[PDB]
Design an enzyme around this catalytic site. Structure first.
Site, PDB file in Angstrom:
ATOM      1  N   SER B 698       1.284  -1.418  -0.422  1.00 34.45           N
ATOM      2  CA  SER B 698      -0.090   0.437   0.062  1.00 34.45           C
ATOM      3  C   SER B 698       1.222   1.335   0.155  1.00 34.45           C
ATOM      4  O   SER B 698       1.098   2.471   0.913  1.00 34.45           O
ATOM      5  CB  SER B 698      -1.059   0.430   0.820  1.00 34.45           C
ATOM      6  N   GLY B 868      -4.501   0.279   0.212  1.00 32.66           N
ATOM      7  CA  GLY B 868      -4.777  -0.579  -0.687  1.00 32.66           C
ATOM      8  C   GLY B 868      -5.271  -1.939   0.014  1.00 32.66           C
ATOM      9  O   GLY B 868      -6.534  -1.992   0.219  1.00 32.66           O
ATOM     10  N   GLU B 869      -4.517  -1.456   1.261  1.00 29.86           N
ATOM     11  CA  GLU B 869      -4.807  -3.179   2.100  1.00 29.86           C
ATOM     12  C   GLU B 869      -5.507  -3.075   2.855  1.00 29.86           C
ATOM     13  O   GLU B 869      -6.083  -3.109   4.210  1.00 29.86           O
ATOM     14  CB  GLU B 869      -2.859  -3.691   2.685  1.00 29.86           C
ATOM     15  N   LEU B 870      -6.057  -1.943   3.719  1.00 31.15           N
ATOM     16  CA  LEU B 870      -6.676  -1.297   5.006  1.00 31.15           C
ATOM     17  C   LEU B 870      -7.777  -2.115   5.088  1.00 31.15           C
ATOM     18  O   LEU B 870      -7.460  -3.088   5.997  1.00 31.15           O
ATOM     19  CB  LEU B 870      -6.933   0.333   4.496  1.00 31.15           C
TER      20      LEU B 870
END
Ligand code: FES
Ligand code: FES
Ligand code: FES
Ligand code: FES
Ligand SMILES: [Cl-]
Ligand SMILES: [Cl-]
Ligand SMILES: [Cl-]
Ligand SMILES: [Cl-]
Ligand SMILES: [Mg+2]
Ligand SMILES: [Mg+2]
Ligand SMILES: [Mg+2]
Ligand SMILES: [Mg+2]
Ligand SMILES: [Mg+2]
Ligand SMILES: [Mg+2]
EC number: 1.2.99.7
Lengths: 907, 907
Positions: B698, B868-870
């Site tokens: 991210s 992105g990964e949150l």
């Protein structure tokens, strides 16, 4: 390999290419843009024109290394699409510029390039542009293309509204006789009609691509074929030879005349014992691509014993010549013409006589699209062939015994095609592809390149001719004598019939009561004879129409008035003893006369010491029909959606089978008020369309037009309601009544010409015309420029004027080629468009003038005759007569090459 | 073969097909309609949706025999094109429905079919339609797709004007923080963006197509390979094995930790001595087509000695297990976490302690597009690879020694790609295609089918975890203990790093002063580990966030209030001893609280005896960056036409590298008044773009966003005129001044975590969030339905809201999959989308709610963190916490399959 990121038709393309690859291949094969048409592959025809960074280039000669990162390319698909047409495409449709349509994408893309650089060109600017960019057309004579550019430019310039590019229905609602556009025009101008090579690219992965292993000598005994190296080559599946043929391995001429000395089974499918001409197919390589098949075909070794070859008629006809087909004399057919009294005494006592020796040669058809065909085994067990055949039923029976199929097991279909001009009256590739499909069980596709189109399709057959006239001092013809020798190459199909055309058409147009003549057909090792538009008339009438001018000169009479004196009038008969069906030649001559006189005066005034102008006249006549009681059939079907399908096998070379069908049916269906857009035509298919016959002999409008008329009349009867009006489809279906209705028509009054005398009534309808050519000869170089052509034409009644105007312009341009530049004599030099003298735009005058003087035919549908071959009957005689007018030189042997003219000028 | 005359996108097509052929192949290969996308090839994903006679069908499961003569087909190309967009396509663009874009054509064609049958659907009608037609999306979470359908329908219905589907510029002219559409959206929604398989179809004739010869056992010694039968098969060029590899034939992990017991060179390119997992590539068949290569690959015989395989971490970690890589222990890495005081005494004296054993498994990425790549030798002598790499520079150095090239002789390029979700942080096909291109000298193309995508790309690595908390009665955390075992399959790349993530993220979100823990990495013979969105957080935070709920239960405290008590506040440190950079968790919890209370009340009221409703909470945290002082580079270039190109290697999985670049640059360039449409992005290329780094962690918005900002700031300085204003390109060029200007940025405050203690400052920017899940459990079947998800998200500042909203919806849907249905455990059963539990539309609630609570980051560009990964950090913990809320059952080992839930309910 290299990545190239470019824009094609407005869309960014991330391309992966070989820098040596041709842009034409990349666009067609990698991007599926088959609207980029490829013909010649040598940069000579412009069919592959594309816009690259604002310049019009030929994609077949543009390597990818010349395309920069960020380049902009436009193809026809980027100009416009159906339902989003560009003004050029609308204009093309309106002006009838798409006949076969093969050149239409390239001309339109080229024109867009012109208009992007010169928004308001003169006609001359448009002609200069197409000359520079090598945009070639064999169908239209160029004039309609120029008209379309000019109309589009006016719209783009805001000088007229775009809606004026859309056809306006006539007040009466009648499309018969109108300029209604042809149904196929939108697909042609958008590049969305798939021709044979396009279909090949869209065939499945399994499809095998073929290449021909061809003879590279003109005559030989074959000893063997070694395929071993070819079999090891990339992508190669197999090699097919005569051993793989399941029938007779011969094509039959089918209607070989009984007095022919040969059996008509002379032509092999794959050569077995002998090579008979250069180019003969000895084997077929089957591979994963055309390129791989061709590479491997070069490695197939044929062991041959070369034999002396006879490369002209006189050579092969010599009394001691060796039989090319052992057991059959090389001179295999003779047709006498014996009308009236013995001519010798009449010549002896005549006031004036004239004689000449003439030659018309091996004219090459030169369609922009080279031959192509494919075949496959259907899931029904039948063999299907899709080709450029313009006689699908005829060809089925010519090849079925040779390939080893009963007629019900073979189906022939006509693809959309880019012109033929008669070469497809013969089988070319059909039996080859059938044999390969049958042998492999796989779909097969065979594309000829332009060299193969030139070398290994049939040709107009050369005729060596001597013709004589005897006449009174007042110009009245008394008698004719004629002798002609027809060089038909090695394959007999329709050679006897072509020779008979000489008896019918030498001297046609005039009352000649007494005729004695003889035609002879000879096999040679030059290219085999296939029909070429005019089919014996261009030869026959070149001789007679030049000889009429010679007779006028010897009498001190004007050549138009000599024709006026002798032209058919009631009571007269043609050379076969038949009364003409209409008498329009005096009318046409009277209407031409003042134009001719004005042209003479202009030529006198505008001639200079170095540039001599002249005017020449000729008459043309030809039949509409195959000989005797020819016939056709059509089915008229009311469909569930209220449209009507008119089922025929009217084969479309590009002349307008679609519009002929729609226009004829529309006229016949008028009582029921059927809109033209509701009438559908059918592509020819031997399984699912009736035997309407071939598109040869300028016959379809008469024969199939009549059958369509009768079918439609019969459908009207089927739909009639008692009390008045018409039942709908649903009403008929509810009553279990028929909706698909047959019509037939036969030319019942016709008879075949006699084998001994030549006399008969071979056609019930003829076409009649009068040509005028205006030329300038540069007497320092011998170069002739044709400045104008006029055709007075009697077509009876026009089905469609865009179709007929275009047919006439196209034929006149082929006449200019035949007169001045075209031949196929030198096997290699004449195997390109430029080498064989193809007429590019500047060779064809912008002044092509037509005057219709229509006398409705008793037996034609709504009074129509054909048109197809009329304009090539004798334009070349008018042209040569004009050269004589200008300079005093007569060219007797075509073409009038500059050096030939100069030698005559200086003699 | 059969002729079929049909209409495709409004144009009559004269088709020649095999009746058994798939419509998808016909449309793509024969007609060039690559807008028909193919993913699964099994009728499960809808990407190949087309309209056939008014019905939406999957073309990959429709044989040509089902297409009748006269059929009507519509593909995306017939819906609309660039500059002639359909309302559905405009709506897709406006609503951000194209992320990777791979599913967009199929959804849009499917939607047109819906609206042609139901002009005014409810949202529920739209969801039912996409469920029935199997339209699958892995990027968007479906909600944007439904929004787009509804908006288009209103326009088509005349309820609103079509102009409202076009983005309206904000008053300020600021695109930063707006819904400005992404540059690639028009190409995606029109099917005119070419993905790897599309490019393969558009490559030249010479191109070889590859198929993998793969291990069909999990572990073996290889004795030999026999290619003899394969070489004789149709279309086969050659077979490539390890013998043809010109370098080490190993992929290096490159940044292998020094305390790793392995050298990081364990992974072969082509197996030589051993098979290490099912699917390992042993050989490559090169052929003329994918179909021919695959057929021949089945005939390659591999002689193997099968070995016992260790198919889980605990199995391979046993003290007596046999070394999979002889000479390296299977447990090859350990990472301790040692923060504060010894935990044993603190646990002993604590008011309350809790402990749990948890498991998160081998989640499969399941992009709709299966892996694909190609390679070739450039004319410059370099080897080019075009693939789905999301770290082109990283992969170049991972594979160059193995393939035998110096780094300057290899170029890696990222194709447009249909999603990765991390699997492309690993090399997959790049070294395979390079080896084949180098060996043959020819272009090569390799496409995986969906089974190969599942079996033979890397996976989320399973973690077996034990976590413990000690706390005061008031809920204050005192200490944590942690143990995790990471099953990384046989290939070590980034396994050590993934294990370190456990030290960083187990218990993240809270002040925990005292931590003692240990992570261990183990090689197994199950699928190798590749990053999967969240990269250790989904494992880590599942354990800690479930354990927080267990702690709340034992205290009799509300789980949201327990989190409130402990959430980071100034003075606190994270598990690695670092101070957080912002403190937004209390703010987010306070804003969520009333929504949570209302959701609890709704669940109480709407629960029935059989359908129990619950609400669950979790926190998520993850870094934006690679560990330590990560960096990026960008070049900002003023072009001659006044546009500006921002050169980066920001790799686009589909998340929005294009819009991130444009939006960030636009904001940075505002002083010079640069319109967004004038800013161009660059596709990643190791030769011509700077080393911006991979799109993992991210990181790109922070790292490359900052580099873009600095480059643009530097370009502004380069363009500044003395006296004010800006020079034009022409002015700068006339003065011989630079126009292409570099910018760099480094996360200078970061440090790597220590090998002994785990302590450090690994990221300078983190992402923070709070999840709420609302679920219903059918207690008769064990089936859980997720009725709603909420994410409170602190992203600092939004570059683009269409991008961020979509990222969050996509991650939440993957969370629902991870919680309830997804795994890759059974090599065959889980090798299809349906078999592995892919979430189709009905599994994802229409209620996906986001609340931004943005606290600008000191080091982020304009205050931004990543996103992105949150959304996949812990949604699955919220969901499982909700199941517990509903029913009293805790699922400790994912996924919560119905039978597993039922067994727990009934215990
Ligand atoms: S000029 Fe290119 S095909 Fe003729
Ligand atoms: S229409 Fe031009 S070549 Fe036929
Ligand atoms: S449903 Fe056809 S490719 Fe997935
Ligand atoms: S946008 Fe739907 S799968 Fe990527
Ligand atoms: Cl001569
Ligand atoms: Cl010459
Ligand atoms: Cl469990
Ligand atoms: Cl289950
Ligand atoms: Mg327009
Ligand atoms: Mg015989
Ligand atoms: Mg008389
Ligand atoms: Mg519209
Ligand atoms: Mg080692
Ligand atoms: Mg405190």
């Amino acid at each position: 390999m290299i990545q190239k990121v470019i824009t094609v038709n407005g869309i960014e393309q991330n391309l992966f290419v070989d820098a040596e690859a041709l842009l034409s291949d990349v666009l067609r094969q990698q991007l599926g843009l088959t609207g980029v048409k490829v013909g010649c592959e040598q940069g000579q025809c412009g069919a592959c024109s594309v816009i690259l960074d604002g310049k019009v280039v030929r994609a077949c000669v543009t390597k990818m290394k010349r395309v920069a990162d960020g380049a902009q390319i436009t193809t026809i698909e980027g100009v416009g699409q159906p339902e989003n047409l560009h003004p050029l495409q609308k204009a093309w449709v309106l002006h009838g510029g798409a006949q076969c349509g093969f050149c239409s994408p390239g001309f339109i893309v080229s024109a867009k390039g012109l208009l992007d650089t010169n928004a308001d060109p003169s006609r001359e600017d448009v002609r200069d542009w197409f000359q520079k960019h090598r945009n070639a057309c064999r169908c239209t004579g160029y004039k309609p293309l120029v008209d379309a550019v000019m109309d589009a430019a006016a719209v783009i310039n805001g000088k007229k509204p775009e809606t004026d590019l859309e056809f306006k229905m006539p007040a009466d609602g009648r499309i018969w006789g109108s300029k209604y556009p042809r149904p196929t025009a939108v697909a042609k101008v958008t590049g969305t009609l798939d021709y044979g090579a396009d279909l090949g690219l869209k065939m499945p992965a399994g499809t095998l691509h073929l290449a021909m292993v061809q003879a590279k000598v003109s005559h030989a005994n074959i000893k063997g074929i070694d395929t071993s190296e070819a079999l090891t080559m990339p992508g190669v599946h197999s090699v097919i030879t005569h051993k793989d043929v399941k029938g007779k391995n011969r094509i039959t001429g089918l209607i070989t005349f009984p007095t022919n000395k040969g059996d008509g089974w002379d032509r092999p499918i794959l050569c077995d014992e002998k090579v008979f001409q250069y180019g003969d197919c000895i084997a077929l390589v089957c591979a994963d691509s055309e390129a791989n098949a061709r590479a491997a075909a070069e490695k197939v070794k044929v062991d041959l014993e070369e034999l002396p070859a006879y490369m002209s008629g006189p050579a092969a006809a010599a009394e001691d010549a060796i039989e090319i087909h052992p057991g059959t004399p090389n001179v295999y057919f003779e047709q006498p013409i014996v009308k009236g009294e013995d001519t010798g005494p009449i010549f002896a006592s005549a006031d004036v006589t004239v004689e000449g020796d003439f030659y018309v040669g091996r004219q090459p058809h030169m369609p922009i699209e080279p031959d192509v065909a494919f075949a496959y085994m259907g899931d029904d067990g039948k063999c299907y062939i899709h080709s450029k055949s313009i006689g699908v039923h005829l060809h089925l029976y010519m090849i079925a015994p040779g390939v080893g199929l009963e007629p019900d097991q073979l189906v022939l279909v006509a693809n959309p095609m880019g012109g033929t001009f008669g070469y497809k009256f013969s089988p070319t590739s059909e039996a080859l592809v059938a044999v390969a499909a049958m042998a492999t069980g796989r779909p097969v596709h065979l594309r000829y390149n332009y060299q193969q189109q030139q070398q290994y399709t049939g040709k107009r057959s050369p005729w060596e001719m001597n013709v004589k006239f005897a006449a009174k001092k007042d110009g009245t013809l008394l008698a004719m004598e004629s002798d002609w020798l027809v060089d038909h190459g090695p394959y007999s199909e329709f050679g006897d019939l072509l020779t008979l055309r000489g008896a019918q058409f030498i001297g046609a147009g005039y009352n000649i009561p007494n005729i004695r003549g003889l035609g002879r057909t000879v096999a040679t090792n030059h290219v085999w004879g296939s029909a070429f538009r005019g089919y014996g008339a261009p030869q026959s009438m070149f001789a007679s129409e030049c000889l009429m001018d010679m007779l006028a000169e010897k009498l001190g009479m004007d050549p138009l008035e000599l024709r006026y004196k002798n032209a058919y009038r009631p009571g007269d008969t043609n050379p076969t003893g038949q009364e003409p069906e209409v008498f329009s030649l005096p009318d046409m001559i009277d209407q031409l006369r003042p134009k001719y006189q004005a042209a003479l005066e202009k030529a006198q005034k505008e001639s200079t010491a170095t540039h001599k102008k002249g005017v020449g006249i000729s008459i043309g006549v030809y039949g509409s029909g195959l000989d005797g009681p020819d016939a056709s059939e059509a089915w008229a079907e009311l469909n569930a959606d209220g449209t009507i399908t008119v089922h025929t096998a009217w084969e479309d070379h590009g002349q307008g089978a679609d519009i002929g069908c729609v226009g004829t049916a529309h006229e016949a269906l008028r009582p029921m008020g059927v809109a033209p857009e509701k009438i559908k035509f059918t592509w020819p298919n031997t399984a699912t369309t009736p035997n309407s016959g071939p598109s040869g002999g300028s016959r379809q409008q008469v024969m199939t037009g009549n059958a369509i008329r009768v079918a439609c009349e019969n459908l009207l009867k089927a739909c009639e309601k008692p009390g008045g009006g018409y039942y709908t489809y649903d009403e008929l279906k509810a009553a279990d009544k028929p909706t698909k209705i047959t019509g037939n028509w036969t030319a019942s009054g016709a008879t075949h010409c006699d084998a001994v005398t030549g006399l008969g009534k071979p056609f019930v309808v003829y076409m009649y015309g009068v040509f005028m050519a205006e030329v300038t000869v540069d007497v320092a170089t011998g170069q002739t420029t044709v400045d104008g052509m006029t055709l007075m034409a009697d077509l009876g009644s026009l089905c469609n004027q865009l179709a007929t105007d275009g047919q006439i312009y196209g034929g006149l341009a082929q006449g200019i080629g035949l007169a001045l530049s075209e031949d196929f004599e030198d096997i290699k030099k004449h195997a390109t468009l430029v080498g064989a003298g193809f007429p590019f735009i500047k060779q064809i005058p912008d002044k092509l003038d037509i005057v219709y003087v229509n006398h409705p035919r008793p037996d034609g549908p709504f009074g129509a005759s054909g048109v197809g071959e009329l304009p090539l009957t004798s334009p070349h005689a008018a042209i040569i007569n004009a050269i004589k007018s200008a300079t005093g030189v007569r060219i007797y042997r075509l073409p009038a090459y500059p050096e030939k003219v100069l030698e005559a000028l200086k003699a």
